[PDB]
Design an enzyme around this catalytic site. Structure first.
Site, PDB file in Angstrom:
ATOM      1  N   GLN A  19       0.657  -1.216  -0.028  1.00  0.00           N
ATOM      2  CA  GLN A  19      -0.138  -0.040  -0.040  1.00  0.00           C
ATOM      3  C   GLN A  19       0.827   1.060  -0.181  1.00  0.00           C
ATOM      4  O   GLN A  19       0.739   2.241  -0.663  1.00  0.00           O
ATOM      5  CB  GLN A  19      -0.989   0.027   1.191  1.00  0.00           C
ATOM      6  CG  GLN A  19      -0.289   0.116   2.485  1.00  0.00           C
ATOM      7  CD  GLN A  19      -0.992  -0.102   3.516  1.00  0.00           C
ATOM      8  OE1 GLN A  19      -2.039  -0.959   3.722  1.00  0.00           O
ATOM      9  NE2 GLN A  19      -0.999   0.817   4.604  1.00  0.00           N
ATOM     10  N   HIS A 162      -6.167  -1.647  11.552  1.00  0.00           N
ATOM     11  CA  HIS A 162      -5.585  -2.143  10.330  1.00  0.00           C
ATOM     12  C   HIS A 162      -6.323  -3.175   9.566  1.00  0.00           C
ATOM     13  O   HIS A 162      -6.932  -4.212  10.337  1.00  0.00           O
ATOM     14  CB  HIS A 162      -4.297  -2.642  10.327  1.00  0.00           C
ATOM     15  CG  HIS A 162      -3.506  -2.923   9.191  1.00  0.00           C
ATOM     16  ND1 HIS A 162      -3.199  -1.750   8.430  1.00  0.00           N
ATOM     17  CD2 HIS A 162      -2.961  -4.141   8.499  1.00  0.00           C
ATOM     18  CE1 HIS A 162      -2.376  -2.484   7.162  1.00  0.00           C
ATOM     19  NE2 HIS A 162      -2.279  -3.575   7.403  1.00  0.00           N
ATOM     20  N   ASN A 182      -1.681  -9.585   4.247  1.00  0.00           N
ATOM     21  CA  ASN A 182      -1.300  -8.099   4.262  1.00  0.00           C
ATOM     22  C   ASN A 182      -1.105  -7.393   3.314  1.00  0.00           C
ATOM     23  O   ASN A 182      -1.121  -7.830   1.913  1.00  0.00           O
ATOM     24  CB  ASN A 182      -0.237  -8.045   5.615  1.00  0.00           C
ATOM     25  CG  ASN A 182      -0.410  -6.720   6.618  1.00  0.00           C
ATOM     26  OD1 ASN A 182      -1.044  -5.557   5.722  1.00  0.00           O
ATOM     27  ND2 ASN A 182       0.307  -6.839   7.544  1.00  0.00           N
TER      28      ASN A 182
END
Length: 215
Positions: A19, A162, A182
């Site tokens: 990200q 998160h 993730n």
């Protein structure tokens, strides 16, 4: 319902992305969940566009965070989300650029998972596929995870910051676990993945904001 499942091995899981400086975990977590479903219903695994989510989900905050349900409802209301080929990830806020011809998946709503019920989560993973969830990733022991079944008691099982994706479960050296994907790159964790303590009392509050789209 099996003792172990791993949707990576069933072709449901795209490669791990980064990200970057952008707080778009919720977008990757939605796009991955839609990807797991799109693969379940069409049999073809196509990378979807989290950049579409961060630009156009106006009830969220772009690279300032957001909700995954907010994005599922968006692709329902908008009639589609683009593919990451049509709509690449750039890591920074911009205006909506959703081309409807580039539409690669649709959504018909979402379902949320009872808060706290890990048994419900396991079931959902087993018979739906990858599930979008949100944890407390603030701890240093998480940012420098590498291997094993993660458990840190200082993990806030109450406030959650998160978004990751649940892509299966299992056991290892006796500890039942969740396999999560993730968005911090392959250099984080076990090549982007982590095992999380399962049935250890909702560790890191994983069933607080679990959800998946309908297809």
């Amino acid at each position: 319902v099996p003792d172990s499942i791993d949707y990576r091995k069933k072709g449901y899981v795209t490669p791990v992305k980064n990200q970057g400086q952008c707080g778009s975990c919720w977008a990757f977590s939605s796009a991955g969940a839609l990807e797991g479903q799109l693969k379940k219903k069409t049999g073809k695994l196509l990378a979807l566009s989290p950049q579409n989510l961060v630009d156009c989900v106006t009830e969220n905050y772009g690279c300032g965070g957001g909700y995954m349900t907010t994005a599922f409802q968006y692709v329902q209301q908008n009639g589609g989300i683009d593919s990451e080929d049509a709509y690449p990830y750039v890591g920074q806020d911009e205006s909506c650029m959703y081309n409807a011809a580039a539409k690669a998946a649709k959504c018909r709503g979402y379902r949320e998972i009872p808060v706290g019920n890990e048994k419900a989560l396991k079931r959902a993973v087993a018979r739906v596929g990858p599930i979008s969830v949100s944890i407390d990733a603030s701890l240093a022991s998480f940012q420098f995870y590498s291997r094993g079944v993660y458990y840190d008691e200082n993990c806030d099982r109450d406030n959650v910051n998160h978004a990751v994706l649940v892509v299966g479960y299992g056991t290892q050296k006796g500890s039942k676990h969740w396999i999560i994907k993730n968005s911090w790159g392959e250099s984080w964790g076990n090549k982007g993945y982590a095992l999380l303590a399962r049935n250890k009392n909702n560790a890191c509050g994983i069933t607080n904001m679990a959800s998946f789209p309908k297809m």
